Design an enzyme around this catalytic site. Structure first.
Site, short mmCIF file in Angstrom:
data_model
loop_
_atom_site.label_atom_id
_atom_site.label_comp_id
_atom_site.label_asym_id
_atom_site.label_seq_id
_atom_site.Cartn_x
_atom_site.Cartn_y
_atom_site.Cartn_z
N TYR D 42 -14.86 -23.88 -29.99
CA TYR D 42 -14.78 -24.54 -28.70
C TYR D 42 -14.09 -25.90 -28.64
O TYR D 42 -14.18 -26.70 -29.57
CB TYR D 42 -16.21 -24.68 -28.20
N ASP D 86 -12.84 -28.73 -17.33
CA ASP D 86 -13.43 -29.56 -16.27
C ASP D 86 -13.38 -28.94 -14.87
O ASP D 86 -13.96 -27.88 -14.64
CB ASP D 86 -12.76 -30.93 -16.24
N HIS D 112 -13.64 -22.76 -19.08
CA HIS D 112 -14.66 -22.80 -18.05
C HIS D 112 -14.27 -23.92 -17.09
O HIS D 112 -13.72 -24.96 -17.49
CB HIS D 112 -16.09 -22.98 -18.63
N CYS D 122 -10.98 -44.36 -4.94
CA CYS D 122 -10.61 -45.22 -6.07
C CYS D 122 -11.82 -45.87 -6.75
O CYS D 122 -11.91 -45.91 -7.99
CB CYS D 122 -9.64 -46.29 -5.57
N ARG D 157 -18.82 -22.66 -14.64
CA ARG D 157 -19.95 -23.51 -14.98
C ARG D 157 -20.53 -24.18 -13.72
O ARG D 157 -19.76 -24.65 -12.87
CB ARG D 157 -19.52 -24.57 -15.96
#
Lengths: 290, 290, 290, 290
Positions: D42, D86, D112, D122, D157
């Site tokens: 991973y 992400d 994922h 920002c 996820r």
């Protein structure tokens, strides 16, 4: 099965004779070539040096520079891409292999490796010296052994004509193919009859480099076909024209303080959008959601 | 002290009025711009997307694609390079800063960030919305704060004129400058008088985007100077001309089976060599060694 | 003036005697080194090959693999970084220069090049030959000439002691320095007295490579100072320990079906956060905004 | 046919239950994991941030940073690699697709994508907010539609437990799989029974994140198997141990001026050579020539 760009390159060879392969300096030009109808394209090593790096073709570019151009191009254009891999980016067999594998992984359909020496000492001036026949056979074997995709093409280029004469160049070619080379790229051929001799000496397809201002005359596809040439290559043609066009724009703008008089030399905004399939993006969204 | 591309840029503004800044699609064209006499160049965001990646200007290009072109260009061409940084390549102050620091280390002289909203949801269709005045102020604050070279330029680009009318556009500009914006790039102006109005409202140099096939007229440098504009930008001019010339070659070669009829549209080999300072390499070797 | 990693390196040599330089395999470890109090770090060539690429130190790693690690490290860690540049990543003066300029722009404080021959033919087996004194002199000349930052360091590394005996080793060192070499890295010394001999022969700082499991003893900083050595290098120390700890985890987890029994060998989450200045990010946001 | 790393990932799933998937921070550690017997590995997003960039996991890393780590690892290790992608590196569906295609091309077996928001302004502080169910369904659809290799794995996820409770997290999971998700990664589960509920609600394999110091206890493979968990993930275990080991080396060296007392914590030179198959290189040469 998963797509093999090498497979497509070899297929395009079967379909066209000679196969016209055009140099594409960047992804945008690969799209233009695809639109003009070509079935295979090319990444010139001299173009990576001169166009992407603004450097002379003296072995300064690195594999990395070439790998990023290969990804940029093949990420958006599906045409098979032949890559100029110079002498393999490294002296060792380990280097030749990493280059071969990296290039396949980056998306290329094949590459050509030549028999030039490069630089032997820090102060070695740019030259056209070539290694022994044996040394080149070793590079070829290392490259073929590295193919991770059986259909990826390993083409061998020889620059032996200028420094050893025709008979020796042909003889090297026979040894190169014997070592594993799948296609042959005889450099700077001067007469149609010579190609036929290469075609006759090696039983693998041969490429004729129809570049812009060197030793080779501008042979037509019909003439090359008569010489039993399997591929016609125009490594920098588009690039040379693009440069003159840009230069003229830079000059006029600088001289006249406005680009008004060179507007008619410009690809329009609508044309650019068509070229990069700008509207196919609005379509992707409509198909997926909203 | 160490050379500062940003300082040199600021110095260019004092040597020309307005400063002509031409977009250079790659390292090669940056050199043609320098040989044409320009003192500052530009890296168009749409140019990186359309030429380098062959993609529409819809925010698909990443910081990394832009960085690569920044390094290729500035590694060989000493002209200060102004860069299009879209909204900072990320929605967080942390992204804006990493972008500023990275562009500086890659070699850029300055960059501009805009007040565009960008894509909100995954299915977001291209839109022309702008963040609040406060939000852009925060982006500008993060950018200036991240400068590692005090002379690097943070220019703010605003499309407020076409979205909220002149007065509001000027209100944003003043707040942007107060937030640290060092130069202003107001979009969509169609009248010289308007440039004068922006110039009058903020005490920072203003840039006029003289791109083709848009809503804005092809103003001359003299017209621009009369309206108090400090720099004239030609973002994709040479690029638009290069594509047409390249396209013409691909088509003619495909139809005719030879490029013979378009050789006269090509940059000669001598011009190529001269453009990339070819002769300086052997001269370098003779100067360093025996 | 703009910050110079090279200048800071030279300054570190005056603050410590000898200067301890520890190899940092990645950005994270550069920060652990900084938090441990070190004032200079190192990017091992074998380390980039073995840790970053998982390859043996046989010249397969390229300039680009090393550049990436230089940027990752120096983008976040301000300590001066000394870099292993092997023989310059290329056989030509043009390669040496591109390597020097690139490493500087990537953020390095200095680099060392060695007089190794490298791979001659494609089938070349690992060998310990060194180029002539004149050839290394040319490499050193090309390197110094390419410096874009006057304070960047060009260190010459020589394996002449194990190849040609002490006197010849010292003869090369003097010629290397006269060629512009700013610091010397003599390989394979097994006695303190020898370091003193090199120190006595050249008026440039000398580096002692205190790596493990080699022919050289584990000299202490005090022993090194007594022999007039200016810096003590520990190229892969933390790396060797990290691999064992990682290996232990992979094995225990595989055998036991849980890592529960090795939790006590792990850096805690608080230690992770502290090591990477986690808390400085929210502090940054509060300092810049409301 | 050409190798499909996704295919191998799914095969390893069929063979092991639960499939242990271990985080590998770099190529070297991927080799160590392969040697310890793992069948899948991973690339932690937090590890790319903390280890390769020395940055907190706050969305600062870019796709590029991840892509280079994927290539480095998969170029030398053939084990299938699951990648932490992400939220897709970009808000648009166009961004999600480019990431998916780039990652497959770089060599990954799957990835994922989660339902987190990221940063909306920002000054938006690091947070764990998550997008609506619909928004995540759109990300999932865009990602699946982008698979260039039908066997590449798209895992979804969900971080909904912490902010919406169990029932809502399960409900989202059912909608995610319905949208195309091929496997499910429920984050921060606290009790074995919960996994079984996810296993029962969605008919696709579920991954349990057995990370080092969070909300999830250190469940054994036997316990996870009883809960119908298809994969056990240890994203940073090796990395945490490697850091403590390196830190200790840095500290002792700094405190004692020699590494003598931590030698016994080091992987030996011979071990390192074994790990990177140093001698298989001498074999490659012997097989090819000389």
């Amino acid at each position: 099965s998963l797509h093999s760009p090498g497979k497509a390159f070899r297929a395009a060879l079967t379909k066209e004779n000679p196969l016209q392969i055009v140099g594409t300096i960047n992804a945008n030009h690969a799209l233009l070539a695809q639109r003009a109808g070509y079935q295979a394209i090319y990444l010139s090593g001299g173009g990576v040096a001169a166009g992407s790096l603004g450097l002379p073709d003296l072995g300064i570019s690195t594999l990395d520079d070439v790998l990023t151009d290969i990804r940029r191009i093949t990420d958006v254009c599906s045409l098979p891409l032949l890559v100029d891999a110079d002498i393999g980016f490294g002296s060792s067999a380990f280097n030749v292999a990493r280059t071969v594998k990296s290039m396949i992984k980056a998306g290329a359909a094949g590459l050509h490796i030549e028999d030039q020496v490069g630089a032997k000492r820090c102060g070695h001036r740019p030259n056209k010296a070539i290694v022994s026949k044996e040394e080149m056979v070793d590079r070829i074997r290392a490259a073929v052994d590295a193919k991770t995709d059986p259909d990826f093409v390993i083409m061998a280029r020889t620059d032996a004509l200028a420094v050893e004469g025709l008979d020796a160049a042909i003889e090297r070619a026979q040894a190169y193919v014997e070592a594993g080379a799948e296609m042959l790229f005889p450099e700077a051929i001067t007469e149609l009859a010579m190609y036929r001799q290469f075609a006759d000496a090696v039983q693998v397809p041969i490429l004729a480099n129809i570049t812009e201002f060197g030793a080779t005359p501008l042979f037509t596809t019909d003439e090359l076909r008569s010489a039993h040439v399997a591929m016609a290559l125009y490594p920098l043609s588009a690039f040379r024209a693009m440069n003159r066009a840009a230069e003229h724009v830079y000059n006029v703008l600088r001289q006249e303080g406005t680009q008004k008089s060179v507007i008619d030399t410009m690809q329009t905004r609508n044309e650019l959008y068509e070229s990069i399939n700008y509207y196919q993006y609005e379509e992707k969204l409509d198909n997926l959601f909203a």
